[PDB]
């Protein structure tokens, strides 16, 4: 059911939705 | 890697979790 392609943006934001880990973890950029 | 995965391949909803901790 929740077997997609989430590359560009979708990850990054994925992480807030769930358990954002964008703070002094894997905070990357592109 | 971390988004490797869900982006040349497909991941599920605990590939993503894992993240989290």
Redesign the interface.
């Given at each position: 059911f929740v077997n997609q392609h989430l590359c560009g943006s979708h990850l990054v934001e994925a992480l807030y939705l769930v358990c954002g880990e964008r703070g002094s973890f894997y905070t990357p950029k592109t | 890697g971390?988004?490797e995965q869900?982006?040349?391949?497909?991941?599920?909803?605990y590939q993503?979790?894992n993240?989290?901790?």
């Open positions: - | 971390i988004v869900c982006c040349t391949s497909i991941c599920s909803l993503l979790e993240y989290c901790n």
